[PDB]
Design a protein. Structure first.
Lengths: 223, 223
């Protein structure tokens, strides 16, 4: 019961009972020390999970490796702690691990696997690369590399792009990839306005949507 | 609503409410046709989801990793007709989504426990770039090649590398990781995720030598 609990939040503006299992509420009602990135939004979230909680009398910890080790002390002493994250948290888990403290991850929404699931691609072997290079040619060569890995290693390739650039990317995808390579575009995941469909590169030409106001995940694979 | 809902189940033996959003129960109550990897586990599952769900709605369509894409299409007919359908596991589901995307049918994944993202979370490793490889090469030397390459990619792309192992082969794997991997590379062992017999600790290969903790788990390699 004494551990650094990892409490996930919703992916977008959707109700809590939709992506967070009730269990997370129960254990949250048992913590008083929360390591948070943004104090006002964590409080905003904690109110969203239960009005009954004393929002005013809780110890939040905004998140340096020296301060991290300090914020972990209540846990070292035996108190249930919690980290509410969307990644300013990986470092807190990492150091907790180094100090051989108990870390426990609670279930929550993940755009990476939700897209792996609705893409229709090989889920037993996929790789996420975060963002791709900004400088063209480099970005044009990475796509090439990732696409070759698809065919060589039967590994699904995923990545992301900032919203106002989703079109430059899809344009870079349909201009540098093989006509028959497969692409899945996953937008407002769980947001209900959600767009996750898969098509051949060659066939995205005529029915490509907007999606420049929300981030989305891109996946490449084969037939 | 009218679509192919990808339904997740529990990772182990735990109360469904500890790892599944209650929203999932609402839509399950709606679905009359399920595509599953096994009617036994699936049917038993829906019982735990809701007592009222009369399992006399025997329309469970069996699915395999070799099920014909033609038959899958037939399985989707109800969805094509305007009725919502669900997919239940415990990979073959990947083939169903693939056929469904091909027919441009609506697909929607629901939140569930993923040993893959939960692990990344509790390891403290890079969550903005990781790769799942499933099972590694069975024969030795081929397994050393793989571990060696994964490890090189770790430093070459700053990307967490993930792979799983069959229950019995567990101890033989840790032996392999520490024989072929560098002493400073980090290895995270994650066993019984969400089952509270749970064990998820990160530690360098050098420090794993002593104190090695059968039953299934996942492995993560980082820097």
């Amino acid at each position: 019961e004494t551990a650094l609990y990892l409490l996930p939040v919703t992916l977008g503006d959707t109700p809590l009972e939709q992506v967070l299992p009730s269990y997370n509420t129960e254990i949250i009602r048992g913590i008083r020390h929360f390591i948070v990135e943004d104090v006002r939004s964590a409080r905003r979230f904690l109110k969203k999970v239960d009005r009954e909680i004393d929002i005013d009398s809780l110890t939040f910890y905004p998140l340096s490796p020296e301060d991290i080790s300090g914020y972990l002390k209540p846990l070292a002493g035996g108190a249930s702690m919690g980290v509410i994250s969307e990644d300013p948290g990986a470092d807190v888990v990492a150091i907790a691990q180094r100090q051989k403290l108990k870390v426990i991850p609670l279930v929550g929404p993940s755009s990476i696997i939700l897209s792996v699931m609705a893409s229709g691609f090989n889920g037993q072997s996929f790789a996420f690369h975060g963002y791709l290079p900004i400088e063209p040619g480099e970005r044009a060569k990475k796509l090439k590399t990732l696409e070759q890995r698809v065919y060589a290693e039967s590994q699904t390739q995923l990545f992301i792009e900032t919203p106002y650039r989703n079109h430059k990317m899809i344009e870079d995808i349909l201009q540098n990839c093989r006509p028959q390579t497969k692409l899945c575009i996953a937008a407002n995941i769980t947001c209900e306005g959600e767009f996750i469909q898969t098509r051949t590169v060659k066939d995205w030409k005529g029915h490509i949507p907007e999606l420049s106001k929300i981030p989305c995940i891109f996946l490449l694979y084969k037939l």
